[PDB]
Amino acid sequence: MRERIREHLSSEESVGLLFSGCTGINDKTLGARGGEVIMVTSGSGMGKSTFVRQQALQWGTAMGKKVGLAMLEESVEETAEDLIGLHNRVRLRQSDSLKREIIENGKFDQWFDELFGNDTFHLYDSFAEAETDRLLAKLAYMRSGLGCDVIILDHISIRKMIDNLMTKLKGFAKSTGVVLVVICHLKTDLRGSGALRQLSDTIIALERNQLVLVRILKCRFTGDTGIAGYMEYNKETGWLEPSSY
Amino acid sequence: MRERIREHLSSEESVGLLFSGCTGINDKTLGARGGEVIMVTSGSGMGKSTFVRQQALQWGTAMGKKVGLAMLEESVEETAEDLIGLHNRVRLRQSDSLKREIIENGKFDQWFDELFGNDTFHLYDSFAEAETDRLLAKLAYMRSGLGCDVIILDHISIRKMIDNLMTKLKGFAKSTGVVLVVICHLKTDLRGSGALRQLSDTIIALERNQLVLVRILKCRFTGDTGIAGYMEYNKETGWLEPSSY
Amino acid sequence: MRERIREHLSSEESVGLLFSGCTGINDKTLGARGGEVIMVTSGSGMGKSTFVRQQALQWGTAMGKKVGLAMLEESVEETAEDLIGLHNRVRLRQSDSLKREIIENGKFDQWFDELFGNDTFHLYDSFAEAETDRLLAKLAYMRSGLGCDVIILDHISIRKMIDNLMTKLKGFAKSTGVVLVVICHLKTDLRGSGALRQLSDTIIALERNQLVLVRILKCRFTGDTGIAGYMEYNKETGWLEPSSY
Amino acid sequence: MRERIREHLSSEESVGLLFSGCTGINDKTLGARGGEVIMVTSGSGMGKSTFVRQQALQWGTAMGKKVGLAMLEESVEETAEDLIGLHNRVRLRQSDSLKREIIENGKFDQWFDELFGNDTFHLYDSFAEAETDRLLAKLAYMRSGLGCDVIILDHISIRKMIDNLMTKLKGFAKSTGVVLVVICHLKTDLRGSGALRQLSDTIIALERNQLVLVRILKCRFTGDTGIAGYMEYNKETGWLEPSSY
Amino acid sequence: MRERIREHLSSEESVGLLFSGCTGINDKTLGARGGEVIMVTSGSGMGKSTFVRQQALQWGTAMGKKVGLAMLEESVEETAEDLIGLHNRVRLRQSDSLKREIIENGKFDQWFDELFGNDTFHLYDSFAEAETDRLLAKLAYMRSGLGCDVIILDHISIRKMIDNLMTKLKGFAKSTGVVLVVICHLKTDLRGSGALRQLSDTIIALERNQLVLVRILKCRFTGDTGIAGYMEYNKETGWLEPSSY
Amino acid sequence: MRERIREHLSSEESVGLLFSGCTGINDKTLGARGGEVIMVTSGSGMGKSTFVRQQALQWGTAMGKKVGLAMLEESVEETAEDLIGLHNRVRLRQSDSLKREIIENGKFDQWFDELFGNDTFHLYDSFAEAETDRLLAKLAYMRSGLGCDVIILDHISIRKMIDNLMTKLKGFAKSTGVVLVVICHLKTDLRGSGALRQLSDTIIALERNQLVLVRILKCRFTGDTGIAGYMEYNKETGWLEPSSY
Ligand SMILES: Cc1cn([C@H]2C[C@H](O)[C@@H](COP(=O)(O)OP(=O)(O)OP(=O)(O)O)O2)c(=O)[nH]c1=O
Ligand SMILES: Cc1cn([C@H]2C[C@H](O)[C@@H](COP(=O)(O)OP(=O)(O)OP(=O)(O)O)O2)c(=O)[nH]c1=O
Ligand SMILES: Cc1cn([C@H]2C[C@H](O)[C@@H](COP(=O)(O)OP(=O)(O)OP(=O)(O)O)O2)c(=O)[nH]c1=O
Ligand SMILES: Cc1cn([C@H]2C[C@H](O)[C@@H](COP(=O)(O)OP(=O)(O)OP(=O)(O)O)O2)c(=O)[nH]c1=O
Ligand SMILES: Cc1cn([C@H]2C[C@H](O)[C@@H](COP(=O)(O)OP(=O)(O)OP(=O)(O)O)O2)c(=O)[nH]c1=O
Ligand SMILES: Cc1cn([C@H]2C[C@H](O)[C@@H](COP(=O)(O)OP(=O)(O)OP(=O)(O)O)O2)c(=O)[nH]c1=O
């Protein structure tokens, strides 16, 4: 047992992929570990995607990880546009001028390669179809075929479709060891559903004004729950910034 | 993806129909885009119609757009009287004298043609009936038949009638691409209802003394919320003017 | 529409029954129109009845209108005594001498006929009962049977009794087209209640020393709010006079 | 109505019990009428009791009225001593000599009968208890049993005790028609309380040096407010005298 | 009978193994007696294992008892890691640093012997198989072969598998006299099942925030039910502490 | 018939052995009559034995009756321990201290004689065997040989064993005239079985929290059914007390 415990002790990965922008989030969660399902939820337009996109950007950019992004709702161009702006600390969607200037400028192309030139980000859309298996098959490919370290499922809104999917999702993450982050629409802990709350390893909720409050609704590994801290959205750069609240 | 993003970038219309009279409204919203539902709300007699009528006037007059106006509460003559006065910076309803003077003067007729002579404004009333489909059918006609760029629904007060209508309205706007502005009576964000808040793309609220404060309660496209600025109602011209508050 | 607007323009009555004694009141309200409910409120003993009685006197006396007066609190003799004095610029209630002198003098009778001789004023009391319908039935009779142009309800103090009554009152005024002035006891805009503020077309508030300030809390038709002006109560004649404040 | 108004006119009592010592008080109030509650207030030691006692003396002495005096704070002997001195234009309480001289002199007894010999004054004390009903029952007896025309409640200082009492007091005065004068301690109009200000028909306030200023804070019947005049306290006779201020 | 009762009285063990960390738990239960089945239940991640592990630690450490721990879900290394940390008031699983530091430090080995050096704790895993008898045979061995005073079954979630097992478990405890604590997952009293509630001698439920509330759902021996008290989880030491709620 | 009815009237015993601790139980049942079978049922650990033991104590102690107690489940020492504690308003089983203190104290012996010194209570156990006749023979002996007035059968849980036994029990009670109280385990009226419900003359059910509610499910003699009242268990004395629910 002794030797058995020892190697067990020296082989265990407690700290996963560290989160960014929110001082305290890593304290209460110790980052994202492989095989876990992170659920990021909140009200519509409350900043779910931004937050996740930001994590994706850092992970694939600074942590040198391969990030797959599966979009159920929006298109790849939309997602790409968002990452490019984010990466360049500008909001392409808000500036008809910038979009136009950047294309003739040659900065678009320069920006495109400086981000997707490498084999780091894998964006997939067209899952418009309500079939889970079709979805799991693509996810499994992103993992195995493209070697994605992290897979972001954007998004899901609260039957078996969700129940069974959540159970399939959790199964896929646990067996492969990839980090699966799922974005779910909440229209508190109960605000979700059975499997949603149950299968998810860590649940993060963003709250706003009615500055974003980052609440850790659940973290199996750590058990440390409560509010991790606050973030301040930069309307000019589109980045969620750490706050002094 | 590259070419896919590029054309996507160069084909996207971020800035819609610009609003008028309130310095800052366009900052936080970037105007009214086609396919979106703009909700303008506030207390009764707080200036909702005036504000909307003003936007209508400029859109159809200066922006060279076709504006359809569907009145649920008041008559076409009433609406026409309002636009004519507005257009002529006078308040016809307040002056028994002006009304009388303008008719024999010949200015009425001159005013009438100089405004409705063209095929720009389309006023429709008699929707007194509480039937949605009867209403949607007329709206669809204003869009297709009369080629209206903007449709103003005046008005609605806070069931399914509103819920289902809001969902029908939003469906009609999104599929056709017309700009649908709806005026709703509020007797804050919650001050409305589910679909009311949910389906509406941009929600504008006017506040007064208890000078009008223009608050942007919600803007999906931009996410930029808060107070856009102030306006000053001209009791002599009936126009809401930009303020130096 | 053109012809439709025209006749609409030449048929609309913007200026109603003009008020008296307060320079500016007509500016911000354009008088009292038929079908509207005018609410006159203020603190107890602040001059509500006097003000209304004065308007009644002029309307029925100079404007050649038929005025019905329904008193909930006081008796007809009391009301008559007040009008007679007012009409004769003397305060009967304050002078035991005058009352006595006028009766033997023969001036009482001369005063009585010179005021009520004609079919212009209709005073009704004994509504001591808290039943609305009993009240509405009498009002409707004053309108139809006695052809009253203006009906003054004196008085009401701030449930459904008031809520439902206000809604019944407003219904009666709107459908008949009579001018209904209601006197309400306030123990600002909120100082009242839902229907009270809501159904009332124009709300006038009198303010005193803690010379009477005439504040226009609300005017649907005009929207012109604020203080209309000042009046000076004549302790010798009992008349509220226009001031030079 | 005519005959109805006439008799109404010839039966109405405008002028009540006239006040004394202050030239102008009767002008702005027309005296004390039966069924009304007169409130006399001011700072402690400002001359409230003296003023009231003086009115009592004249009413019961010259006006040939029956005056009941209910003392909550002091004793009957104290009150009697005060009236006797007042009546004899001397201050018994200030002169150990006079008190002693008057008793052996035989003037005490002569003074006692010449004042209380008759059935005009009714002094009652021992209401030390904070029970209203116990108090109302005594008051009602003074009215009915002893036929008191005027009842003076001395005193009250500013809950429901006061609120409910004021409402009970006003009820008792209105239904019986007695004149009820209440002395209240003020530690302006607001200086009192709800019912205090509300139920009281006439409110008199005495002001001094920081010669007594007599201010009429409120008079329902007349509406005539403001300062009625000035009085000059005679430190030798204890009488408040009319002034030439 | 007398002598029969006497010795009966002087031979009966009312107070069993005292619990720790929760002031009041022993009051309502009088500890854990041999032959009884203690059921500790609550929601997943609510602190069941910690609580039980803590009791185990004290029993085997301070009470000088032999504690067998049978883990159905997790491994021995995991369990050992937990006890070692607990014993050393540190959370090994949360600190990649501590784990690493402790191994080279030599503190691991020192910690290992200072806890398992003796023959006090007996950890057994690999019961992954759903066979009861295979399970009962191991338990019986832990009792007889290893002389375990207390056996902790971790864990069971709510057929006959549970029904029959619960009946086998209770049979084993009653006949041997060992103290059997079973941890069951609850997804109130009914929240369990027939045998679960029936065979269990004492049922403890932990409740948290939607500080841990310790509720005694059932205690045959004592009958004393209700909430025993509160505990406060120390996120730094991993120990559940007694509270001042 | 007359004389026949008369003596019949004057010889009939309507009121039996009165129950204790529950205000109302005697109202709806009129006590326990000889020849009747009282069934006391409820959930396990719901207080059946306590309740019955209490009745036994009072009957044999205060009513001067001879009470036989036949225990099927537990031993005589256990039963004796319970009665002694009950009799001394202490819970011997819960206090290892008291048990020990009382024995050396000499209070045990004093307690033993002061309760069983006399020939009032007859406790019999060892009926562990499932034979009815063996059981009936002992019961018959307790009646005839020991002259027991009341016999308590503790206990029975819900075939013919119960059916035939219930029929034998009822036969024994009816023919001898003893009062037979039987305690049955219920795992409403139907909650039992044929003979159980049928042969039993009076059925009492205790209900608790999911303070004990005493429900009279059946009373042949009286027919008066429903809830008799409430009792409050004293965790310190072990006595069920009458409540103020
Ligand atoms: C957090 C935040 C978001 N936003 C904007 C950016 C986007 O245009 C918009 C939505 O942000 P998202 O990140 O898309 O929010 P969401 O993912 O919760 O929304 P949905 O229900 O649509 O999936 O709001 C702000 O303008 N300010 C802010 O502080
Ligand atoms: C904003 C404003 C309005 N108004 C007047 C103009 C109109 O006669 C009246 C109502 O303005 P509207 O524009 O009709 O206000 P609304 O649409 O919120 O009202 P409703 O509940 O009746 O639909 O108020 C002013 O007088 N001053 C002002 O500053
Ligand atoms: C305005 C005014 C009123 N008054 C007097 C006239 C009346 O006797 C008395 C009340 O005037 P009212 O016109 O009766 O005042 P009101 O209608 O607000 O009162 P209520 O609560 O009793 O219904 O006040 C003055 O003496 N001076 C003034 O300046
Ligand atoms: C008015 C006045 C009163 N006084 C004296 C007479 C009395 O001894 C004393 C109080 O007069 P009071 O009439 O008792 O005054 P008050 O009723 O307001 O007082 P309290 O709070 O005690 O009830 O003051 C003067 O000496 N000079 C004056 O000018
Ligand atoms: C009670 C408590 C537990 N925890 C953590 C410690 C662990 O990592 C995690 C689970 O505690 P456990 O003791 O494992 O809870 P459990 O046994 O009820 O759970 P399961 O369903 O998984 O068998 O929660 C806290 O972080 N804070 C607390 O206050
Ligand atoms: C009624 C009651 C019982 N008890 C306890 C006393 C005993 O130790 C235990 C059982 O009471 P019993 O009187 O034995 O209950 P029962 O006869 O229905 O049970 P069984 O199925 O075991 O035959 O419960 C309380 O602690 N509180 C109470 O309020």
Side-chain angles (χ1 to χ4, degrees), chain A residues 42-51 91 94 155 183 185 208 211-212 233 240, chain B residues 219-224:
Chain A
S42 89
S44 175
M46 248 61 264
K48 232 130 350 65
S49 300
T50 292
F51 175 81
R91 298 184 61 184
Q94 322 297 304
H155 66 250
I183 288 148
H185 277 337
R208 176 155 60 137
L211 204 77
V212 47
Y233 186 81
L240 273 166
Chain B
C219 191
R220 230 125 80 57
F221 182 93
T222 217
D224 198 347

Short mmCIF file of all heavy atoms in Angstrom, two decimals, chain A residues 42-51 91 94 155 183 185 208 211-212 233 240, chain B residues 219-224, ligand 1:
data_model
loop_
_atom_site.label_atom_id
_atom_site.label_comp_id
_atom_site.label_asym_id
_atom_site.label_seq_id
_atom_site.Cartn_x
_atom_site.Cartn_y
_atom_site.Cartn_z
N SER A 42 -25.76 30.77 -17.22
CA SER A 42 -26.20 32.11 -16.83
C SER A 42 -27.34 32.55 -17.74
O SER A 42 -27.77 31.80 -18.61
CB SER A 42 -25.04 33.10 -16.94
OG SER A 42 -24.99 33.65 -18.25
N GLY A 43 -27.83 33.77 -17.56
CA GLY A 43 -28.92 34.25 -18.40
C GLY A 43 -28.42 34.56 -19.83
O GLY A 43 -27.25 34.80 -20.06
N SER A 44 -29.35 34.56 -20.78
CA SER A 44 -29.01 34.87 -22.17
C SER A 44 -28.38 36.27 -22.25
O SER A 44 -28.85 37.21 -21.61
CB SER A 44 -30.27 34.81 -23.04
OG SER A 44 -29.98 35.21 -24.37
N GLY A 45 -27.31 36.41 -23.03
CA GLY A 45 -26.61 37.70 -23.21
C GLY A 45 -25.83 38.15 -21.96
O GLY A 45 -25.35 39.28 -21.91
N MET A 46 -25.70 37.26 -20.98
CA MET A 46 -24.98 37.56 -19.73
C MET A 46 -23.45 37.41 -19.86
O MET A 46 -22.72 37.75 -18.94
CB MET A 46 -25.55 36.73 -18.55
CG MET A 46 -26.28 37.64 -17.53
SD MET A 46 -27.69 38.50 -18.29
CE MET A 46 -26.85 40.05 -18.67
N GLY A 47 -22.95 36.95 -21.03
CA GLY A 47 -21.49 36.85 -21.28
C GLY A 47 -20.91 35.42 -21.24
O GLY A 47 -19.71 35.24 -21.07
N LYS A 48 -21.74 34.41 -21.40
CA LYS A 48 -21.27 33.03 -21.36
C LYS A 48 -20.20 32.74 -22.42
O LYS A 48 -19.10 32.29 -22.09
CB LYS A 48 -22.43 32.05 -21.53
CG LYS A 48 -22.39 31.04 -20.38
CD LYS A 48 -23.77 30.89 -19.70
CE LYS A 48 -24.76 31.97 -20.18
NZ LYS A 48 -24.98 31.68 -21.62
N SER A 49 -20.53 32.97 -23.68
CA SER A 49 -19.63 32.71 -24.81
C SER A 49 -18.34 33.48 -24.73
O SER A 49 -17.27 32.94 -24.96
CB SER A 49 -20.30 33.01 -26.14
OG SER A 49 -21.43 32.18 -26.25
N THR A 50 -18.44 34.76 -24.40
CA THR A 50 -17.26 35.58 -24.30
C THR A 50 -16.28 34.93 -23.34
O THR A 50 -15.13 34.66 -23.67
CB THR A 50 -17.62 36.99 -23.80
OG1 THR A 50 -18.38 37.66 -24.81
CG2 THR A 50 -16.35 37.78 -23.54
N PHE A 51 -16.77 34.67 -22.13
CA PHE A 51 -16.01 34.06 -21.05
C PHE A 51 -15.33 32.77 -21.51
O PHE A 51 -14.14 32.58 -21.31
CB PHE A 51 -16.95 33.78 -19.87
CG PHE A 51 -16.21 33.04 -18.79
CD1 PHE A 51 -15.39 33.74 -17.90
CD2 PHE A 51 -16.35 31.67 -18.69
CE1 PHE A 51 -14.72 33.04 -16.89
CE2 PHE A 51 -15.68 30.97 -17.68
CZ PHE A 51 -14.86 31.66 -16.79
N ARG A 91 -13.43 44.82 -31.42
CA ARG A 91 -14.75 44.23 -31.67
C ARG A 91 -15.18 44.41 -33.13
O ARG A 91 -15.81 45.40 -33.50
CB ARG A 91 -15.80 44.85 -30.76
CG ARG A 91 -15.43 44.56 -29.31
CD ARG A 91 -16.53 45.08 -28.38
NE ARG A 91 -17.80 44.40 -28.68
CZ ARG A 91 -18.94 44.73 -28.08
NH1 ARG A 91 -18.99 45.76 -27.25
NH2 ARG A 91 -20.01 44.04 -28.30
N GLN A 94 -18.81 45.24 -34.16
CA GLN A 94 -19.37 46.55 -33.83
C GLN A 94 -18.90 47.67 -34.75
O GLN A 94 -19.40 48.79 -34.68
CB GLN A 94 -19.01 46.94 -32.39
CG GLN A 94 -19.06 45.69 -31.49
CD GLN A 94 -20.48 45.15 -31.47
OE1 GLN A 94 -21.41 45.88 -31.13
NE2 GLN A 94 -20.73 43.93 -31.85
N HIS A 155 -24.18 25.80 -28.09
CA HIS A 155 -24.52 25.73 -26.68
C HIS A 155 -25.70 24.77 -26.49
O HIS A 155 -26.14 24.06 -27.41
CB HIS A 155 -24.90 27.12 -26.13
CG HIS A 155 -26.16 27.62 -26.78
ND1 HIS A 155 -26.17 28.68 -27.66
CD2 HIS A 155 -27.47 27.23 -26.65
CE1 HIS A 155 -27.45 28.89 -28.03
NE2 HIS A 155 -28.28 28.03 -27.44
N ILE A 183 -21.70 25.03 -22.60
CA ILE A 183 -22.41 26.26 -22.32
C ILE A 183 -23.91 25.98 -22.34
O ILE A 183 -24.45 25.48 -23.33
CB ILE A 183 -22.07 27.29 -23.40
CG1 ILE A 183 -20.63 27.77 -23.20
CG2 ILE A 183 -23.04 28.48 -23.29
CD1 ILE A 183 -20.03 28.11 -24.57
N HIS A 185 -28.02 27.36 -21.43
CA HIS A 185 -28.87 28.52 -21.17
C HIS A 185 -29.84 28.29 -20.03
O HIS A 185 -30.56 27.29 -19.99
CB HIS A 185 -29.60 29.05 -22.41
CG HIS A 185 -28.63 29.93 -23.12
ND1 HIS A 185 -27.57 30.52 -22.46
CD2 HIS A 185 -28.53 30.34 -24.42
CE1 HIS A 185 -26.88 31.24 -23.36
NE2 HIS A 185 -27.43 31.16 -24.57
N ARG A 208 -25.13 39.25 -13.53
CA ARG A 208 -24.96 40.65 -13.86
C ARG A 208 -26.13 41.61 -13.52
O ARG A 208 -27.22 41.51 -14.04
CB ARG A 208 -24.58 40.76 -15.35
CG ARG A 208 -24.48 42.23 -15.83
CD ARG A 208 -23.53 42.33 -17.04
NE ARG A 208 -24.02 41.51 -18.17
CZ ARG A 208 -24.01 41.96 -19.44
NH1 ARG A 208 -23.76 43.23 -19.69
NH2 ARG A 208 -24.24 41.15 -20.42
N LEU A 211 -20.21 44.92 -14.78
CA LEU A 211 -19.56 44.05 -13.77
C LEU A 211 -20.32 42.73 -13.64
O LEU A 211 -21.53 42.70 -13.44
CB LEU A 211 -19.64 44.83 -12.47
CG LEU A 211 -18.53 44.34 -11.54
CD1 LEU A 211 -17.21 44.95 -11.99
CD2 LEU A 211 -18.83 44.77 -10.11
N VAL A 212 -19.58 41.64 -13.79
CA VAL A 212 -20.16 40.31 -13.73
C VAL A 212 -19.62 39.51 -12.55
O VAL A 212 -18.41 39.37 -12.36
CB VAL A 212 -19.81 39.56 -15.02
CG1 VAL A 212 -18.33 39.75 -15.31
CG2 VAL A 212 -20.11 38.07 -14.87
N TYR A 233 -16.45 43.71 -17.93
CA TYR A 233 -16.45 43.62 -19.39
C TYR A 233 -15.98 44.92 -20.04
O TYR A 233 -16.50 46.01 -19.76
CB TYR A 233 -17.86 43.30 -19.90
CG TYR A 233 -17.86 43.07 -21.40
CD1 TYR A 233 -17.48 41.83 -21.92
CD2 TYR A 233 -18.28 44.09 -22.26
CE1 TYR A 233 -17.52 41.60 -23.29
CE2 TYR A 233 -18.32 43.86 -23.64
CZ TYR A 233 -17.94 42.61 -24.15
OH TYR A 233 -18.01 42.37 -25.50
N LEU A 240 -13.34 40.24 -20.96
CA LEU A 240 -13.84 40.30 -19.60
C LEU A 240 -12.60 40.49 -18.75
O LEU A 240 -11.66 39.69 -18.85
CB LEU A 240 -14.54 39.00 -19.17
CG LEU A 240 -16.02 39.05 -19.58
CD1 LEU A 240 -16.62 37.65 -19.48
CD2 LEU A 240 -16.78 39.98 -18.64
N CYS B 219 -29.92 45.55 -25.63
CA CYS B 219 -29.45 45.60 -27.02
C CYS B 219 -28.60 44.36 -27.30
O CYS B 219 -27.42 44.31 -26.99
CB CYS B 219 -28.61 46.87 -27.29
SG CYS B 219 -28.29 47.09 -29.06
N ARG B 220 -29.24 43.32 -27.84
CA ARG B 220 -28.60 42.04 -28.13
C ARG B 220 -27.31 42.20 -28.92
O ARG B 220 -26.25 41.75 -28.50
CB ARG B 220 -29.54 41.17 -28.95
CG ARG B 220 -29.63 39.80 -28.30
CD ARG B 220 -31.10 39.46 -28.03
NE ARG B 220 -31.76 38.98 -29.27
CZ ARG B 220 -31.33 37.93 -29.98
NH1 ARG B 220 -30.19 37.37 -29.69
NH2 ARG B 220 -32.06 37.47 -30.95
N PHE B 221 -27.45 42.79 -30.09
CA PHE B 221 -26.38 43.01 -31.04
C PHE B 221 -25.15 43.64 -30.40
O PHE B 221 -24.02 43.21 -30.63
CB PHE B 221 -26.91 43.90 -32.16
CG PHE B 221 -25.86 44.14 -33.22
CD1 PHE B 221 -25.77 43.31 -34.34
CD2 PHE B 221 -24.99 45.22 -33.08
CE1 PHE B 221 -24.81 43.56 -35.32
CE2 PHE B 221 -24.03 45.47 -34.06
CZ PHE B 221 -23.95 44.64 -35.18
N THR B 222 -25.36 44.69 -29.64
CA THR B 222 -24.26 45.43 -29.02
C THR B 222 -23.96 45.04 -27.58
O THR B 222 -22.81 45.05 -27.15
CB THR B 222 -24.58 46.93 -29.11
OG1 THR B 222 -23.40 47.68 -29.35
CG2 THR B 222 -25.26 47.42 -27.82
N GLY B 223 -24.99 44.70 -26.82
CA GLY B 223 -24.85 44.32 -25.41
C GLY B 223 -24.68 45.57 -24.54
O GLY B 223 -24.81 45.50 -23.31
N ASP B 224 -24.38 46.71 -25.20
CA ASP B 224 -24.18 47.99 -24.55
C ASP B 224 -25.51 48.50 -23.99
O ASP B 224 -26.43 48.84 -24.74
CB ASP B 224 -23.61 49.00 -25.57
CG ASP B 224 -22.97 50.21 -24.88
OD1 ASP B 224 -23.17 50.39 -23.68
OD2 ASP B 224 -22.28 50.96 -25.56
C1 LIG G 1 -20.84 40.40 -20.35
C2 LIG G 1 -21.21 41.39 -21.41
C3 LIG G 1 -21.67 41.03 -22.62
N1 LIG G 1 -22.00 41.93 -23.56
C4 LIG G 1 -22.53 41.71 -24.97
C5 LIG G 1 -21.53 41.01 -25.89
C6 LIG G 1 -22.49 40.30 -26.86
O1 LIG G 1 -22.82 41.08 -28.01
C7 LIG G 1 -23.74 40.04 -26.02
C8 LIG G 1 -23.90 38.57 -25.54
O2 LIG G 1 -22.71 38.10 -24.82
P1 LIG G 1 -22.55 36.52 -24.76
O3 LIG G 1 -21.18 36.16 -24.31
O4 LIG G 1 -23.03 36.01 -26.07
O5 LIG G 1 -23.59 36.06 -23.67
P2 LIG G 1 -24.37 34.67 -23.56
O6 LIG G 1 -23.47 33.68 -24.17
O7 LIG G 1 -24.80 34.46 -22.17
O8 LIG G 1 -25.62 34.91 -24.56
P3 LIG G 1 -26.71 34.01 -25.46
O9 LIG G 1 -27.96 33.80 -24.70
O10 LIG G 1 -27.03 34.96 -26.69
O11 LIG G 1 -26.04 32.80 -25.97
O12 LIG G 1 -23.65 40.90 -24.89
C9 LIG G 1 -21.87 43.33 -23.31
O13 LIG G 1 -22.17 44.17 -24.17
N2 LIG G 1 -21.41 43.72 -22.08
C10 LIG G 1 -21.08 42.82 -21.16
O14 LIG G 1 -20.64 43.29 -19.98
#
